[PDB]
């Protein structure tokens, strides 16, 4: 993990990057800010190339589409709280998700959006913007404080609130027991395993495969080949993670490394060639008047 590049936000006393994802264009990183702006930066030069105001509150998440034509955003207290933006020719808003606090694309074919409102998942058609399904069973809920509904790699399962749903039947097939208060779970890209905080479960048998204590309270990201798993722990805007990330072998969940960057972490993401890890790091403490974040680029 060699440092390659570092930059702060242009024309800012105090630097406000909150989250990042690589653009479909090679050398260019998208970043959200605490004033609800989307910015496009040269990740090597640190030159700000473009700026749009998407929301009148801080960006909490973004995800570009694989084909570079679409972008999802989520903000903090703005209405609408999340939105879908078009990026071909002019930048403009296509649809808005009035109360969804988090949104993701479908993974296999990026024709659908899945949004989260508290305990409840919503699915949307991208063309029409219509709500196709609501996935919510109050007898099966876990009430995860940081619930984030997500499609599996083939788009036919959904994890919401520790419940596995079958998208075609709108049927709850399994509720995983609650073993923490905050983390709801992601799908392994291999389509066989789901990862919920420190537990790894099998999708065909529901047997526990692994305990990984160092994942506690971590947000999980995979590299694009699905051979490496990165973990950023949430904190005991304000700083969403503490100051270290762990890397694990994705097939056997053995630790490769614990990197301590000595700064609280806001976000991290991989490029599509698994060449680079981009990390948002706060130089200030939680008690500073203002945020002071930088984006560091590391070679992996
Ligand atoms: N109203 C408009 C829309 C248009 C415009 C202005 C600035 C920037 C831009 O592209 C961006 C911005 C942010 C990201 Cl992350 C990616 C691309 C488009 C010209 N005028």
Swiss-Prot record:
Region described as WD repeat-like region: 12-211
Protein's cellular compartments: Cytoplasm; Nucleus; Cytoplasm, Cytoskeleton, Microtubule organizing center, Centrosome
Tissues and organs where the protein is expressed, per its UniProt entry: Ubiquitously expressed.
WD-type repeats, residues: 12-51, 54-95, 97-134, 136-168, 169-211
Sections of the chain in a coiled coil: none
Motif (DWD box 2) on chain: 199-206
Residue numbers bearing the Phosphoserine modification: 239
Induction: Up-regulated in a number of cancer cell lines (at protein level).
Short motif (DWD box 1): ranges: 163-170
Family: Belongs to the VPRBP/DCAF1 family.
Recorded domain comment: The protein kinase-like region mediates the threonine-protein kinase activity.
Protein's job: Acts both as a substrate recognition component of E3 ubiquitin-protein ligase complexes and as an atypical serine/threonine-protein kinase, playing key roles in various processes such as cell cycle, telomerase regulation and histone modification. Probable substrate-specific adapter of a DCX (DDB1-CUL4-X-box) E3 ubiquitin-protein ligase complex, named CUL4A-RBX1-DDB1-DCAF1/VPRBP complex, which mediates ubiquitination and proteasome-dependent degradation of proteins such as NF2.
Quaternary state and interactors: Component of the DCX (DDB1-CUL4-X-box) E3 ubiquitin-protein ligase complex, named CUL4A-RBX1-DDB1-DCAF1/VPRBP complex. Interacts with DDB1; the interaction is direct. Also forms a ternary complex with DDA1 and DDB1. Interacts with NF2 (via FERM domain). Component of the EDVP complex, a E3 ligase complex containing DYRK2, EDD/UBR5, DDB1 and DCAF1. Interacts with DYRK2; the interaction is direct. Interacts with RAG1; the interaction is direct. Interacts with LLGL1 and LLGL2. Interacts with histone H3. (Microbial infection) Interacts with HIV-1 virus Vpr protein; the interaction is direct.
Name of this protein: DDB1- and CUL4-associated factor 1
Source organism of this protein record: Homo sapiens (Human)
This protein's encoding gene: DCAF1
Full-protein interval shown: 1080 to 1389 of 1507
């Amino acid at each position: 993990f060699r440092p390659i590049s570092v930059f702060r936000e242009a024309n800012e006393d105090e630097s406000g990057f909150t989250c990042c994802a690589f653009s479909a264009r090679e050398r260019f990183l998208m970043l959200g800010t605490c004033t609800g702006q989307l910015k496009l930066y040269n990740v090597f030069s640190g030159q700000e190339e473009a700026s749009y105001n998407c929301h009148n509150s801080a960006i909490t998440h973004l995800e570009p589409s694989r084909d570079g034509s679409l972008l999802l955003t989520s903000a903090t207290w703005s209405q609408p709280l999340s939105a879908l933006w078009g990026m071909k020719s002019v930048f403009d808003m296509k649809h808005s998700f009035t109360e969804d606090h988090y949104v993701e694309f479908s993974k296999h074919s990026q024709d659908r959006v899945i949004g989260t409102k508290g305990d409840i998942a919503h699915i949307y058609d991208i063309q029409t913007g219509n709500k196709l399904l609501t996935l919510f069973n109050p007898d099966l809920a876990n009430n995860y404080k940081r619930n984030c509904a997500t499609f599996n790699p083939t788009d036919d399962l959904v994890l919401n609130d520790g419940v596995l749903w079958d998208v075609r039947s709108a049927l709850a097939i399994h509720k995983f027991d609650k073993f923490n208060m905050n983390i709801s779970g992601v799908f392994h890209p291999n389509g066989l395993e789901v990862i919920i905080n420190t537990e790894i479960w099998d999708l065909r048998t529901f047997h526990l495969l692994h305990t990984v204590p160092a994942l506690d309270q971590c947000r999980v990201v995979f590299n694009h080949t699905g051979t490496v798993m990165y973990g950023a722990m949430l904190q005991a805007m304000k700083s969403p993670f503490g100051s270290s990330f762990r890397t694990f072998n994705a097939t056997d969940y053995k630790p490769i490394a614990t990197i301590d960057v000595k700064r609280n972490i806001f976000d991290l993401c991989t490029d599509t060639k698994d060449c680079y890890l981009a990390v948002i790091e706060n130089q200030g403490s939680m008690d500073a008047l203002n945020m002071d974040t930088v984006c560091r680029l590391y070679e992996v």
